[PDB]
Design a protein around this motif. Sequence first.
Motif, mmCIF file in Angstrom:
data_model
loop_
_atom_site.group_PDB
_atom_site.id
_atom_site.type_symbol
_atom_site.label_atom_id
_atom_site.label_comp_id
_atom_site.label_asym_id
_atom_site.label_seq_id
_atom_site.Cartn_x
_atom_site.Cartn_y
_atom_site.Cartn_z
ATOM 1 N N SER C 1 0.794 -1.216 0.000
ATOM 2 C CA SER C 1 0.000 0.000 0.000
ATOM 3 C C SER C 1 0.830 1.271 0.000
ATOM 4 O O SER C 1 0.379 2.277 -0.545
ATOM 5 N N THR C 2 2.018 1.258 0.595
ATOM 6 C CA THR C 2 2.856 2.441 0.680
ATOM 7 C C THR C 2 4.224 2.143 0.094
ATOM 8 O O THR C 2 4.726 1.019 0.184
ATOM 9 N N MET C 3 4.833 3.172 -0.497
ATOM 10 C CA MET C 3 6.158 3.009 -1.076
ATOM 11 C C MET C 3 7.171 2.594 -0.019
ATOM 12 O O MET C 3 8.105 1.837 -0.307
ATOM 13 N N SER C 4 6.994 3.073 1.211
ATOM 14 C CA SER C 4 7.900 2.690 2.285
ATOM 15 C C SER C 4 7.880 1.185 2.504
ATOM 16 O O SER C 4 8.932 0.541 2.568
ATOM 17 N N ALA C 5 6.684 0.603 2.593
ATOM 18 C CA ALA C 5 6.571 -0.826 2.854
ATOM 19 C C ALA C 5 7.240 -1.636 1.754
ATOM 20 O O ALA C 5 7.982 -2.586 2.027
ATOM 21 N N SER C 7 9.641 -0.645 -0.165
ATOM 22 C CA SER C 7 11.080 -0.440 -0.080
ATOM 23 C C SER C 7 11.706 -1.381 0.937
ATOM 24 O O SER C 7 12.767 -1.962 0.688
ATOM 25 N N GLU C 8 11.056 -1.550 2.087
ATOM 26 C CA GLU C 8 11.596 -2.446 3.100
ATOM 27 C C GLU C 8 11.564 -3.888 2.628
ATOM 28 O O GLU C 8 12.494 -4.660 2.890
ATOM 29 N N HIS C 9 10.500 -4.268 1.922
ATOM 30 C CA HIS C 9 10.406 -5.624 1.390
ATOM 31 C C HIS C 9 11.609 -5.940 0.512
ATOM 32 O O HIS C 9 12.248 -6.985 0.668
ATOM 33 N N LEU C 10 11.943 -5.031 -0.403
ATOM 34 C CA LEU C 10 13.154 -5.195 -1.198
ATOM 35 C C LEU C 10 14.394 -5.169 -0.318
ATOM 36 O O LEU C 10 15.329 -5.952 -0.521
ATOM 37 N N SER C 12 14.820 -6.263 2.494
ATOM 38 C CA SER C 12 14.930 -7.454 3.319
ATOM 39 C C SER C 12 14.954 -8.736 2.503
ATOM 40 O O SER C 12 15.833 -9.580 2.701
ATOM 41 N N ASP C 13 14.009 -8.900 1.583
ATOM 42 C CA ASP C 13 13.859 -10.159 0.870
ATOM 43 C C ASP C 13 14.610 -10.206 -0.447
ATOM 44 O O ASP C 13 14.781 -11.295 -1.004
ATOM 45 N N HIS C 14 15.064 -9.069 -0.964
ATOM 46 C CA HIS C 14 15.627 -9.053 -2.306
ATOM 47 C C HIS C 14 16.937 -8.281 -2.366
ATOM 48 O O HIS C 14 17.242 -7.645 -3.375
ATOM 49 N N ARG C 15 17.725 -8.320 -1.294
ATOM 50 C CA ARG C 15 19.122 -7.912 -1.341
ATOM 51 C C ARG C 15 19.970 -9.152 -1.098
ATOM 52 O O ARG C 15 19.800 -9.836 -0.085
ATOM 53 N N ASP C 16 20.862 -9.447 -2.036
ATOM 54 C CA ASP C 16 21.505 -10.752 -2.116
ATOM 55 C C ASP C 16 22.976 -10.741 -1.743
ATOM 56 O O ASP C 16 23.426 -11.634 -1.026
ATOM 57 N N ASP C 17 23.743 -9.762 -2.212
ATOM 58 C CA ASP C 17 25.150 -9.690 -1.843
ATOM 59 C C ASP C 17 25.363 -9.037 -0.483
ATOM 60 O O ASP C 17 26.505 -8.976 -0.016
ATOM 61 N N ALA C 18 24.299 -8.561 0.154
ATOM 62 C CA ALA C 18 24.420 -7.876 1.432
ATOM 63 C C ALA C 18 24.807 -8.848 2.542
ATOM 64 O O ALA C 18 24.433 -10.024 2.529
ATOM 65 N N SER C 19 25.567 -8.333 3.511
ATOM 66 C CA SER C 19 25.968 -9.088 4.698
ATOM 67 C C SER C 19 26.699 -10.374 4.313
ATOM 68 O O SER C 19 26.420 -11.456 4.829
ATOM 69 N N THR C 20 27.652 -10.240 3.392
ATOM 70 C CA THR C 20 28.343 -11.412 2.865
ATOM 71 C C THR C 20 29.511 -11.836 3.749
ATOM 72 O O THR C 20 29.670 -13.026 4.042
ATOM 73 N N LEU C 21 30.325 -10.883 4.197
ATOM 74 C CA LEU C 21 31.598 -11.207 4.829
ATOM 75 C C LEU C 21 31.436 -11.569 6.301
ATOM 76 O O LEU C 21 32.049 -10.942 7.170
ATOM 77 N N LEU C 22 30.623 -12.581 6.589
ATOM 78 C CA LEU C 22 30.468 -13.063 7.955
ATOM 79 C C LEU C 22 29.926 -14.483 7.915
ATOM 80 O O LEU C 22 29.335 -14.914 6.921
#
Lengths: 50, 94, 99, 50
Positions: C1-5, C7-10, C12-22
């Motif tokens: 319903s909102t652009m903010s929501a 944005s968070e979905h992406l 959280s669920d659709h960032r792939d190379d993030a938080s790799t070096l751990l």
Amino acid sequence: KTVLSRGYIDNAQFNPLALRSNVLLMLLQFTLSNLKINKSSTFTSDVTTI
Amino acid sequence: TASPADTNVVPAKDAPTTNSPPSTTSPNQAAADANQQQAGIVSSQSGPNAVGDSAPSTSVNNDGDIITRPTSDSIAAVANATKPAAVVSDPQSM
Amino acid sequence: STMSALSEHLRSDHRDDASTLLATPMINNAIRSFLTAWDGIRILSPDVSSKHLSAYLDSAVANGPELIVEDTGLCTSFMLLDNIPSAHLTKELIGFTWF
Amino acid sequence: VKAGRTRVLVELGHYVYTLHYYDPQISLDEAPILEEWLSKINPAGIPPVP
């Protein structure tokens, strides 16, 4: 004392007749224990002398 | 809907011999009967199929012998039956 | 319903190379979810956990083997150690000096 | 053997060994260690060689 030893062997003895199998299993456990991936960590630049 | 219990069915551990009752008379026939009764089949419906069958049992050794305890203990038993004293006391010892 | 929501979905669920070096133990299954176009209903993949293992008769519910195990220490299994302590000799030289 | 009259060669294929470290400035006879080692040998197994 992995196999063929429980029950009769003394707490400070090993049975020479079962040596090969015991060694074999010992190596197997040694092998299994290391099955893991070599991850990469962070890095820093060294400035210490040579 | 997509129940895993209906999709990931595999044989349980110790499956081939789990139902075997502890006996020495006719372990294979007894185990076979236990499997049949365990599976919910009744003899009156299996008919002639129940008479000659036999199944693996824990009471039977891999060598094909009637065992009453784990084979390691049998090995332990015979080993313990022969343990000469390490240090003995006799007058003539130097 | 909102652009903010969204944005968070992406984020959280659709960032792939993030938080790799751990070290990352939270490996999930292959399929996360499916969406049926004709009705718009989303189906989530079931998660097998041992709260239920209710296999019928002498059976069991199969589980995936623990494959992804990773290490960040030193790839070794032999250690170097002093079996017998030293005699605590005089040092005769301390260390580096910087100014 | 303890007296200088007999020499013994024991045939072991392979065996588990343990060792002790002593002080060069202290006189001693190592016979008790061996006699202890002898005291735990039986047809079933042996302790580590000292």
